[PDB]
Amino acid sequence: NPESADLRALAKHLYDSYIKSFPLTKAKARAILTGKTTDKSPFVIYDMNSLMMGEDKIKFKHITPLQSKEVAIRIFQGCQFRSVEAVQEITEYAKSIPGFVNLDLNDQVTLLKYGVHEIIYTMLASLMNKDGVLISEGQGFMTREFLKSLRKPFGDFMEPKFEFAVKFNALELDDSDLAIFIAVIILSGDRPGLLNVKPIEDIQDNLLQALELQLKLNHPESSQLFAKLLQKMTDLRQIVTEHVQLLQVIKKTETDMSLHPLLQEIYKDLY
Template sequence: MWCSDDELDSWSTNRVLYSDFYDLCSFSHCLPLAIKQHLQTFKDDVSLHAKSSPLMKKKNGHRSSMVSGAFWQSKNAYMAARTDVWFIIQCYNTMLCVIFTDPTQLDEIVARWVADAHLRTCLYSSEHIADVLRKQALDISKVTYYKNMAHEELWFDCAQKLTLVIQQIIEFAKAVPGFRKFSQDDQIVLLKAGSFELAVLRMTRYYDVNQNCVVYGDALLPMEAFLTTETVEMKLVNNVFEFAKTIAELKLTDTELGLYSALVLLQADRPGLRGTEEIAKLNEAVGRSLCLELDKTHRYPVKGDVSVYAFLLAKMPALRELSMLHQEALSKFKRAAPHLQFSDLHKEIFNVDS
């Protein structure tokens, strides 16, 4: 049986290839049992079909897929692969029919998938942080140590810790379903624009609303420990702490914070993006999943009749302002201390030297 040109074009546009099955299978522990069973059946069918497929060739005794970017760019290759593509489409569509029978089930899958990505890429678990906050008291000697730290030394220390968080954020983004399907250029744009914003969101996990302090390394520090005499830096520190406190007070679950982070990351209006339609669709799916999760734990409005979801959306412009303020403070600092070199990743993400 052959598939139509429309089916091939749709298949090509969405880039749903063999890898999608195995991407989904790698997160099968996030799926409801019924879908796990269907998914395994389709995975077995696809594997069996692939063994006899002309799209698979033996290399050094092992089978390797010819279904790569260069392969799919050729229209002749499309025509030659009709039968194989049709088979994969049918399996994939059948699986999706199972999932889409109940739309909320798909939202739940996205939520579990993103939550898994978030938890796997956090430096410390919520339980560990809670334990540290219970046992850790405000140590005045450590506060004094950071307050007396040289300006350049404080910047360097903060940049090192921020870089560690950004490494985890990059891994998180790569694990968000659909993110790796975007062009490499769009992935880079989203990460450069959103990394600091997601770092601030992750900071909320370390914030103690009772003491107005944050876990920083092995210390519990108040805002005053990070203040300098530079006006922009003071504003940045103050606004970051204020934002972190606001979000921490909501007591979001790890799943909700992960989904909110993905929602912030997947903003289709970031300057320089090309695949805005794809990004907007994924953003919408993540938003639905976040709503579903918030309905379970945050049914009551925050202020008046403002839902927690609406409140979180309203906070997103403030995150962008924090990112721009950080960029301004960093640029000003680099002009004053051009000899100080941060990590390559830090320089690539924040790009103040270009």
């Protein structure tokens, strides 16, 4: 019908920009994880020694890592580099969301500030399984056991992301779905400190209809996938709160570690 059509248009526009904005799709990640691909299988990192041997191979967008720190801290500086780049990818993606760039700039800031961690978690799920997580465009694979093995507080950092991911991955969402879900997360009218909620909520209501239509068309066998997904989005805010707490700890207790300025902006006065 006429309204459906506009919502299908939004879904496609969003998928297109998602594909342009983010380097590694869920499609490719799964192909890499299953062993269903023509590419060279990822270098596995499971201890201090394998990290060091694999550091040569772990390029991201043609950026070579720098060639003396303990395992835990080096792992954290890498996840930090990737996060910064993700924030930048998510910001470009947000700008492609119709109506977002017409919002008050201070509110664009606030939506990103609170949205980015939720989205990062969502997109981590695409790269994870029970065994571990793909890194750096899928050239590496870091075992969950290894990450859990790190000295505290770093040992408890990735584990909740894994716990969330095994449950979220059950919904079997694909890239066309995720593209819409991510936009819905960004356009959340209840972020603290927003100035003008109404045009945010109007955009989110279209996005949510687009999401609902998308899930009916793309997963016609899946009963109320839409409702399940919305329940997960609410779990996920609690989980971002725990993570921000853990970084509060890490900033204070681990003085040998420079937290990147972009990330400081985001974590400051958050929960």
